[PDB]
Design a protein around this ligand. Sequence first.
Ligand code: HBI
Ligand code: HBI
Ligand code: HBI
Ligand code: HBI
Lengths: 99, 99, 99, 99
Amino acid sequence: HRLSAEERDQLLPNLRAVGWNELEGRDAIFKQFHFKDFNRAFGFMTRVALQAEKLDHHPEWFNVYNKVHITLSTHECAGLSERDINLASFIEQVAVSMT
Amino acid sequence: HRLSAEERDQLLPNLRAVGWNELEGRDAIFKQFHFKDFNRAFGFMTRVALQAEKLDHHPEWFNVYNKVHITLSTHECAGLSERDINLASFIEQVAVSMT
Amino acid sequence: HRLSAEERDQLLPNLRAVGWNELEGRDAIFKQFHFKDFNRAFGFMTRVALQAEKLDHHPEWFNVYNKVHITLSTHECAGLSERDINLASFIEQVAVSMT
Amino acid sequence: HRLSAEERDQLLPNLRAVGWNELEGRDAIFKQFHFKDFNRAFGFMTRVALQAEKLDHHPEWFNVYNKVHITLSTHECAGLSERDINLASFIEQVAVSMT
Ligand SMILES: C[C@H](O)[C@H](O)C1=Nc2c(nc(N)[nH]c2=O)NC1
Ligand SMILES: C[C@H](O)[C@H](O)C1=Nc2c(nc(N)[nH]c2=O)NC1
Ligand SMILES: C[C@H](O)[C@H](O)C1=Nc2c(nc(N)[nH]c2=O)NC1
Ligand SMILES: C[C@H](O)[C@H](O)C1=Nc2c(nc(N)[nH]c2=O)NC1
C-alpha cells in the first residue's frame, strides 16, 4: 500500500504531466483546478464525491467559487497508495469533461 | 408566459432538432438522457439542480441508474413559457459535457 | 435472494409501518416523500445517491420540486432483495433529519 | 455593504454564540464543522451549495472527509456583510439537520 519508487516512477508520470505534483515532507500529490464557474466546479466535486464514497477514499480539498484544490494521500501507509493514483486518474477523467 | 405561436414556431424547432419532444396531452416538452453510469447521471442532475434553484424553475425528472427523463413546463401558466426554454438549453449544454 | 414469504414477513412490517407499500403490478416497494422545498429534497437525494453508489444498489425515483417518489426492487432477482430493504432503511434515516 | 460596527453587535451574537469566529487579518468569520461521516458532510455541502448559487454568494470551504471549515466574507465590499450573515444562518439550519 505504499509507493515504491518503481511504482512512483511508473505511476506518477502521467499525472505529473497534467499538473499533479508531490509535496514536501508529506507523501502526497496535489493539483489545482480552475473551472469557469461554480456550477461546473461543484458538479465536478459531486462526481468526485460519488466515487470517493464508492471507493472509500477521500480527497483533501478546498474550494472557492470556480477553483478547487485537491490533495491526495492515503491514511494508513501515510503517503501515496495505488488508491491515490486511481482517484487521481478518475479525477482527471472528470475534470476534462467540464473544462 | 404561454409561448404564443411564432415563438413556439421559432424556439421549439431548435429543441426538437436536438431530440426534445412534445408531450402528448400536456403543454410540455420532454426528453430523455442516457449516460454511461449513475455517476454521470447524478452529476448531470446536480448541475441542473444548481441551475434550477438559481432560476427558480424546476424540472420534473425521473431517474434510474444511468437514465434521466425530463419534463419541462411552467406551473404558473400551466404550460410552456420561456422559462422552460432557457432551462432546456442549459440542460442541453450540460448534457454535452457528460455525453 | 428474492425474499421468501417468511422473509417479507420479517422485514416488511417495520417499513410498512413507516409508509412503504408494495406495488400492485410488481414486486417492489414504493414510498413518496414530501419536503418543505427543493433544497431539502435535492439534499436528501444527494445523501442517498452517495449511499446508492457505495453499495451499488439504485432507486427508481421521481422528483418535482419538493416531492420525491422512490420505488425499490432488486432487478437481478426481479423482486425484493435485502438490498431494497437496507437501502430503504437508510432512506428512512436520511429522511428523518430533514423533518 | 461592509457591515457597520452597530450592525456587527446586533448580528454576530447568535453567530458568536454558535461557534462562529471573527478573523484577525481580515474581515471574515469562520467556523469548523464536524460530522459523523462524509455522507453527511457532503449532503451538507450540497444544501449549502444550492443556497450559495441561489444567492450568488459563495463560501471558502475545505473538506477532508467528515469536517468542513467555512469562511465567509464578501468580495464586493472586502469584508463581512448582511449576506455572509444570512448565509451563515442558513448554514446553521442545515447543520442541525445532520445526524
Ligand atoms: C476506515 C477508513 O476510514 C477508510 O478505510 C478510509 N481511509 C482513507 C480515506 N481517505 C484517505 N485520503 N485516506 C484514507 O486512509 N477515506 C476512507
Ligand atoms: C414562487 C414559485 O413556486 C417559484 O418561482 C417556482 N415556480 C415554478 C417552478 N417550476 C415550474 N415548473 N414552474 C414554476 O412556475 N419551481 C419554482
Ligand atoms: C451492473 C448493474 O447495473 C449494477 O450491479 C446495479 N445493480 C442494481 C442496482 N440497484 C438495484 N436496486 N438492484 C440492482 O441489482 N444498481 C446497480
Ligand atoms: C459577479 C460576482 O462574481 C458574484 O455576484 C459573486 N460575488 C461574491 C461571491 N462570494 C462572495 N463571498 N462574495 C461575493 O461578492 N460569489 C458570487
